[PDB]
Amino acid sequence: LKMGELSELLGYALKRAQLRVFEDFLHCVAPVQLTPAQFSVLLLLDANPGRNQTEIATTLGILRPNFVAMLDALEGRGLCVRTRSSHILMLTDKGRATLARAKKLVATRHEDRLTELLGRDNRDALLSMLATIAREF
Template sequence: MTVSKTSEKSSEKTADTAKVRKDAAETQGQGPGEALQLGELSEQLGYVLKRAQLKVFENFLRCMASLQLTPAQFSVLLLVEKNPGRNQTEIASTLGILRPNFVAMLDNLESRDLCARIRSTNDRRSHILVLTDKGKAVLARAKKLVATKHEARLNELLGPSNREALLGMLSKIANEF
Protein backbone atom coordinates (compact mmCIF):
# COMPACT_ATOMS: atom_id res chain seq x y z
CA MET A 1 0.00 0.00 0.00
CA THR A 2 1.16 3.46 -0.71
CA VAL A 3 -1.12 6.24 0.32
CA SER A 4 -4.45 5.24 1.73
CA LYS A 5 -6.30 8.17 3.13
CA THR A 6 -9.36 7.82 5.28
CA SER A 7 -11.13 10.89 4.14
CA GLU A 8 -12.02 13.51 6.66
CA LYS A 9 -12.41 17.22 6.78
CA SER A 10 -9.40 18.88 5.31
CA SER A 11 -7.47 20.24 8.20
CA GLU A 12 -5.14 22.78 6.87
CA LYS A 13 -4.40 21.93 3.23
CA THR A 14 -4.21 25.14 1.38
CA ALA A 15 -5.63 24.82 -2.05
CA ASP A 16 -4.52 21.65 -3.66
CA THR A 17 -5.20 18.10 -2.72
CA ALA A 18 -7.93 18.88 -0.29
CA LYS A 19 -10.02 20.75 -2.78
CA VAL A 20 -9.38 18.19 -5.45
CA ARG A 21 -10.67 15.42 -3.25
CA LYS A 22 -13.80 17.34 -2.53
CA ASP A 23 -14.43 17.99 -6.19
CA ALA A 24 -13.82 14.38 -7.01
CA ALA A 25 -16.12 13.23 -4.27
CA GLU A 26 -18.89 15.28 -5.78
CA THR A 27 -17.98 14.00 -9.19
CA GLN A 28 -17.89 10.30 -8.47
CA GLY A 29 -19.90 8.12 -10.76
CA GLN A 30 -20.57 10.92 -13.19
CA GLY A 31 -18.77 9.31 -16.08
CA PRO A 32 -20.71 7.30 -18.61
CA GLY A 33 -20.46 3.64 -17.84
CA GLU A 34 -18.66 2.89 -21.03
CA ALA A 35 -15.98 4.08 -23.42
CA LEU A 36 -13.75 6.97 -22.45
CA GLN A 37 -13.32 10.16 -24.42
CA LEU A 38 -9.96 10.34 -26.15
CA GLY A 39 -10.35 14.07 -26.59
CA GLU A 40 -7.33 15.91 -27.89
CA LEU A 41 -5.34 12.72 -27.75
CA SER A 42 -6.62 11.66 -31.14
CA GLU A 43 -5.14 14.84 -32.57
CA GLN A 44 -1.71 14.32 -31.08
CA LEU A 45 0.60 13.19 -33.82
CA GLY A 46 2.93 11.32 -31.49
CA TYR A 47 0.12 9.33 -29.96
CA VAL A 48 -1.44 8.25 -33.25
CA LEU A 49 1.96 7.63 -34.75
CA LYS A 50 2.99 5.33 -31.96
CA ARG A 51 -0.26 3.38 -32.06
CA ALA A 52 -0.02 2.97 -35.81
CA GLN A 53 3.57 1.82 -35.55
CA LEU A 54 2.67 -0.82 -32.99
CA LYS A 55 -0.12 -2.14 -35.15
CA VAL A 56 2.12 -2.29 -38.20
CA PHE A 57 4.88 -4.13 -36.36
CA GLU A 58 2.35 -6.52 -34.88
CA ASN A 59 0.99 -7.29 -38.33
CA PHE A 60 4.51 -7.65 -39.68
CA LEU A 61 5.35 -10.25 -37.07
CA ARG A 62 2.22 -12.22 -37.87
CA CYS A 63 3.03 -12.21 -41.58
CA MET A 64 6.57 -13.32 -40.82
CA ALA A 65 5.70 -15.96 -38.26
CA SER A 66 6.74 -18.77 -40.58
CA LEU A 67 10.17 -17.22 -41.12
CA GLN A 68 10.67 -15.98 -37.59
CA LEU A 69 11.95 -12.60 -38.67
CA THR A 70 11.47 -9.41 -36.68
CA PRO A 71 11.28 -6.04 -38.41
CA ALA A 72 14.79 -5.24 -37.23
CA GLN A 73 16.19 -8.54 -38.51
CA PHE A 74 14.44 -8.07 -41.82
CA SER A 75 15.95 -4.63 -42.17
CA VAL A 76 19.41 -5.99 -41.49
CA LEU A 77 19.07 -8.69 -44.14
CA LEU A 78 17.74 -6.17 -46.65
CA LEU A 79 20.59 -3.77 -45.99
CA VAL A 80 23.29 -6.42 -46.12
CA GLU A 81 21.90 -7.75 -49.38
CA LYS A 82 21.87 -4.30 -50.91
CA ASN A 83 25.31 -3.41 -49.53
CA PRO A 84 27.56 -6.45 -49.48
CA GLY A 85 31.11 -6.00 -48.32
CA ARG A 86 30.29 -3.60 -45.52
CA ASN A 87 31.30 -4.10 -41.94
CA GLN A 88 29.24 -4.23 -38.78
CA THR A 89 29.71 -0.61 -37.84
CA GLU A 90 28.48 0.63 -41.20
CA ILE A 91 25.41 -1.61 -41.31
CA ALA A 92 24.50 -0.96 -37.70
CA SER A 93 24.92 2.79 -37.83
CA THR A 94 22.78 3.30 -40.92
CA LEU A 95 20.04 1.35 -39.17
CA GLY A 96 20.38 3.39 -36.01
CA ILE A 97 21.59 0.38 -34.06
CA LEU A 98 24.45 0.87 -31.65
CA ARG A 99 27.42 -1.37 -32.24
CA PRO A 100 27.26 -3.13 -28.88
CA ASN A 101 23.61 -4.01 -29.44
CA PHE A 102 24.31 -5.21 -32.95
CA VAL A 103 26.55 -8.02 -31.77
CA ALA A 104 23.83 -10.21 -30.29
CA MET A 105 21.64 -9.54 -33.27
CA LEU A 106 24.30 -10.80 -35.64
CA ASP A 107 25.03 -13.74 -33.37
CA ASN A 108 21.41 -14.71 -33.82
CA LEU A 109 21.35 -14.32 -37.60
CA GLU A 110 24.68 -16.07 -37.97
CA SER A 111 23.64 -18.97 -35.75
CA ARG A 112 20.66 -19.47 -38.06
CA ASP A 113 23.03 -19.41 -41.01
CA LEU A 114 21.33 -16.39 -42.55
CA CYS A 115 24.42 -14.22 -42.71
CA ALA A 116 28.12 -14.53 -42.04
CA ARG A 117 30.90 -12.38 -40.64
CA ILE A 118 34.11 -12.45 -42.64
CA ARG A 119 37.39 -11.00 -41.45
CA SER A 120 38.37 -8.31 -43.86
CA THR A 121 41.76 -8.69 -45.49
CA ASN A 122 42.18 -4.96 -45.88
CA ASP A 123 41.43 -4.13 -42.28
CA ARG A 124 41.67 -7.15 -40.05
CA ARG A 125 39.71 -5.41 -37.31
CA SER A 126 36.46 -5.31 -39.20
CA HIS A 127 33.99 -8.02 -40.07
CA ILE A 128 32.51 -7.93 -43.54
CA LEU A 129 28.88 -8.95 -43.59
CA VAL A 130 27.40 -11.17 -46.24
CA LEU A 131 24.19 -13.10 -46.69
CA THR A 132 24.55 -16.86 -46.94
CA ASP A 133 22.69 -18.70 -49.66
CA LYS A 134 20.14 -19.67 -47.09
CA GLY A 135 19.94 -16.05 -46.01
CA LYS A 136 19.28 -14.96 -49.59
CA ALA A 137 16.59 -17.60 -49.96
CA VAL A 138 14.92 -16.68 -46.70
CA LEU A 139 15.06 -12.99 -47.54
CA ALA A 140 13.45 -13.66 -50.91
CA ARG A 141 10.61 -15.50 -49.23
CA ALA A 142 10.34 -12.76 -46.65
CA LYS A 143 10.03 -10.11 -49.33
CA LYS A 144 7.19 -12.02 -50.93
CA LEU A 145 5.39 -12.40 -47.65
CA VAL A 146 5.79 -8.72 -46.89
CA ALA A 147 4.59 -7.70 -50.32
CA THR A 148 1.60 -10.03 -50.53
CA LYS A 149 0.44 -10.12 -46.94
CA HIS A 150 1.76 -7.00 -45.26
CA GLU A 151 2.06 -4.11 -47.66
CA ALA A 152 -0.90 -5.40 -49.63
CA ARG A 153 -3.00 -4.86 -46.53
CA LEU A 154 -1.97 -1.22 -46.62
CA ASN A 155 -3.00 -0.71 -50.20
CA GLU A 156 -6.27 -2.36 -49.39
CA LEU A 157 -6.79 -0.02 -46.47
CA LEU A 158 -5.55 3.27 -47.89
CA GLY A 159 -5.29 2.80 -51.61
CA PRO A 160 -1.98 2.92 -53.50
CA SER A 161 -1.84 6.66 -53.94
CA ASN A 162 -2.56 7.37 -50.30
CA ARG A 163 -0.02 4.75 -49.27
CA GLU A 164 2.57 6.55 -51.36
CA ALA A 165 1.64 9.90 -49.88
CA LEU A 166 1.86 8.46 -46.38
CA LEU A 167 5.33 7.06 -47.01
CA GLY A 168 6.43 10.39 -48.39
CA MET A 169 5.26 12.35 -45.37
CA LEU A 170 6.73 9.88 -42.92
CA SER A 171 10.05 10.01 -44.75
CA LYS A 172 9.98 13.76 -44.59
CA ILE A 173 9.37 13.63 -40.86
CA ALA A 174 12.04 10.98 -40.35
CA ASN A 175 14.62 13.00 -42.24
CA GLU A 176 13.81 16.66 -41.68
CA PHE A 177 12.13 16.88 -38.34
Protein backbone atom coordinates in the same frame (compact mmCIF):
# COMPACT_ATOMS: atom_id res chain seq x y z
CA LEU B 1 -12.38 5.45 -21.10
CA LYS B 2 -11.73 9.19 -21.50
CA MET B 3 -8.77 9.29 -23.93
CA GLY B 4 -8.56 13.04 -23.29
CA GLU B 5 -5.74 14.89 -24.93
CA LEU B 6 -4.01 11.77 -26.48
CA SER B 7 -6.44 11.97 -29.41
CA GLU B 8 -4.85 15.35 -30.34
CA LEU B 9 -1.24 14.09 -30.57
CA LEU B 10 0.23 12.98 -33.86
CA GLY B 11 2.87 11.37 -31.75
CA TYR B 12 0.25 9.04 -30.36
CA ALA B 13 -1.42 7.91 -33.64
CA LEU B 14 1.95 7.36 -35.36
CA LYS B 15 3.06 5.21 -32.43
CA ARG B 16 -0.25 3.12 -32.53
CA ALA B 17 0.04 2.92 -36.35
CA GLN B 18 3.64 1.77 -36.04
CA LEU B 19 2.64 -0.92 -33.48
CA ARG B 20 -0.22 -2.33 -35.55
CA VAL B 21 1.90 -2.55 -38.69
CA PHE B 22 4.60 -4.39 -36.74
CA GLU B 23 2.17 -6.96 -35.26
CA ASP B 24 0.83 -7.70 -38.72
CA PHE B 25 4.34 -7.78 -40.24
CA LEU B 26 5.31 -10.34 -37.61
CA HIS B 27 2.22 -12.47 -38.18
CA CYS B 28 2.83 -12.49 -41.95
CA VAL B 29 6.64 -13.32 -41.74
CA ALA B 30 6.17 -15.90 -38.98
CA PRO B 31 6.85 -18.80 -41.40
CA VAL B 32 10.49 -17.61 -41.22
CA GLN B 33 10.57 -15.85 -37.74
CA LEU B 34 12.08 -12.54 -38.77
CA THR B 35 11.33 -9.36 -36.89
CA PRO B 36 11.19 -6.23 -38.96
CA ALA B 37 14.78 -5.39 -37.90
CA GLN B 38 16.25 -8.78 -38.73
CA PHE B 39 14.42 -8.42 -42.04
CA SER B 40 15.97 -4.98 -42.77
CA VAL B 41 19.37 -6.22 -41.62
CA LEU B 42 19.45 -9.30 -43.93
CA LEU B 43 18.08 -7.10 -46.80
CA LEU B 44 20.80 -4.50 -46.38
CA LEU B 45 23.65 -7.03 -45.99
CA ASP B 46 22.54 -8.71 -49.24
CA ALA B 47 22.15 -5.47 -51.20
CA ASN B 48 25.45 -4.04 -49.85
CA PRO B 49 28.46 -6.40 -50.28
CA GLY B 50 31.83 -4.95 -49.09
CA ARG B 51 30.56 -2.62 -46.32
CA ASN B 52 31.18 -2.95 -42.56
CA GLN B 53 28.68 -3.23 -39.67
CA THR B 54 29.25 0.45 -38.88
CA GLU B 55 27.30 1.43 -41.93
CA ILE B 56 24.36 -1.02 -41.66
CA ALA B 57 23.61 -0.19 -37.98
CA THR B 58 23.85 3.61 -38.25
CA THR B 59 21.73 3.57 -41.43
CA LEU B 60 18.85 1.68 -39.73
CA GLY B 61 19.12 3.81 -36.59
CA ILE B 62 20.34 0.82 -34.50
CA LEU B 63 22.77 1.26 -31.61
CA ARG B 64 26.12 -0.49 -31.75
CA PRO B 65 25.64 -2.80 -28.71
CA ASN B 66 22.15 -3.69 -29.97
CA PHE B 67 23.43 -4.37 -33.50
CA VAL B 68 26.19 -6.69 -32.28
CA ALA B 69 23.62 -8.55 -30.25
CA MET B 70 21.45 -8.94 -33.41
CA LEU B 71 24.22 -10.28 -35.65
CA ASP B 72 25.37 -12.81 -33.06
CA ALA B 73 21.83 -14.42 -33.27
CA LEU B 74 21.59 -14.13 -37.05
CA GLU B 75 24.94 -15.95 -37.03
CA GLY B 76 23.66 -18.33 -34.39
CA ARG B 77 20.72 -19.21 -36.66
CA GLY B 78 23.03 -19.67 -39.63
CA LEU B 79 21.71 -16.80 -41.80
CA CYS B 80 25.00 -14.91 -41.93
CA VAL B 81 28.69 -15.42 -41.67
CA ARG B 82 31.79 -13.23 -41.66
CA THR B 83 34.14 -13.47 -44.62
CA ARG B 84 37.19 -15.81 -44.35
CA SER B 85 40.16 -15.86 -43.43
CA SER B 86 36.28 -9.98 -40.04
CA HIS B 87 33.79 -7.05 -39.87
CA ILE B 88 32.20 -7.57 -43.24
CA LEU B 89 29.39 -10.06 -43.11
CA MET B 90 27.98 -12.05 -45.95
CA LEU B 91 24.69 -13.89 -45.98
CA THR B 92 24.66 -17.63 -46.50
CA ASP B 93 22.49 -19.52 -48.97
CA LYS B 94 19.96 -20.05 -46.15
CA GLY B 95 20.09 -16.27 -45.44
CA ARG B 96 19.08 -15.42 -49.05
CA ALA B 97 16.37 -18.12 -48.97
CA THR B 98 15.05 -16.63 -45.66
CA LEU B 99 15.22 -13.10 -47.21
CA ALA B 100 13.64 -14.10 -50.52
CA ARG B 101 10.83 -16.03 -48.66
CA ALA B 102 10.31 -12.95 -46.47
CA LYS B 103 10.17 -10.32 -49.29
CA LYS B 104 7.55 -12.70 -50.78
CA LEU B 105 5.44 -12.78 -47.59
CA VAL B 106 6.01 -9.06 -46.91
CA ALA B 107 4.95 -8.04 -50.41
CA THR B 108 1.98 -10.43 -50.77
CA ARG B 109 -0.22 -10.53 -47.63
CA HIS B 110 1.22 -7.60 -45.66
CA GLU B 111 2.17 -4.57 -47.86
CA ASP B 112 -0.58 -4.99 -50.51
CA ARG B 113 -3.40 -5.34 -47.96
CA LEU B 114 -2.01 -2.31 -46.18
CA THR B 115 -1.93 -0.47 -49.58
CA GLU B 116 -5.52 -1.32 -50.57
CA LEU B 117 -6.68 -0.06 -47.16
CA LEU B 118 -5.52 3.48 -48.02
CA GLY B 119 -5.00 3.41 -51.82
CA ARG B 120 -1.83 4.40 -53.72
CA ASP B 121 -2.28 8.18 -53.57
CA ASN B 122 -2.53 8.13 -49.77
CA ARG B 123 0.12 5.38 -49.21
CA ASP B 124 2.36 7.56 -51.39
CA ALA B 125 1.26 10.63 -49.37
CA LEU B 126 2.12 8.79 -46.13
CA LEU B 127 5.52 7.53 -47.23
CA SER B 128 6.26 11.20 -48.02
CA MET B 129 5.23 12.89 -44.80
CA LEU B 130 6.77 10.09 -42.73
CA ALA B 131 10.08 10.42 -44.64
CA THR B 132 10.01 14.19 -44.15
CA ILE B 133 9.70 13.55 -40.40
CA ALA B 134 12.64 11.16 -39.95
CA ARG B 135 14.87 13.35 -42.11
CA GLU B 136 13.86 16.83 -40.84
CA PHE B 137 12.44 16.39 -37.25
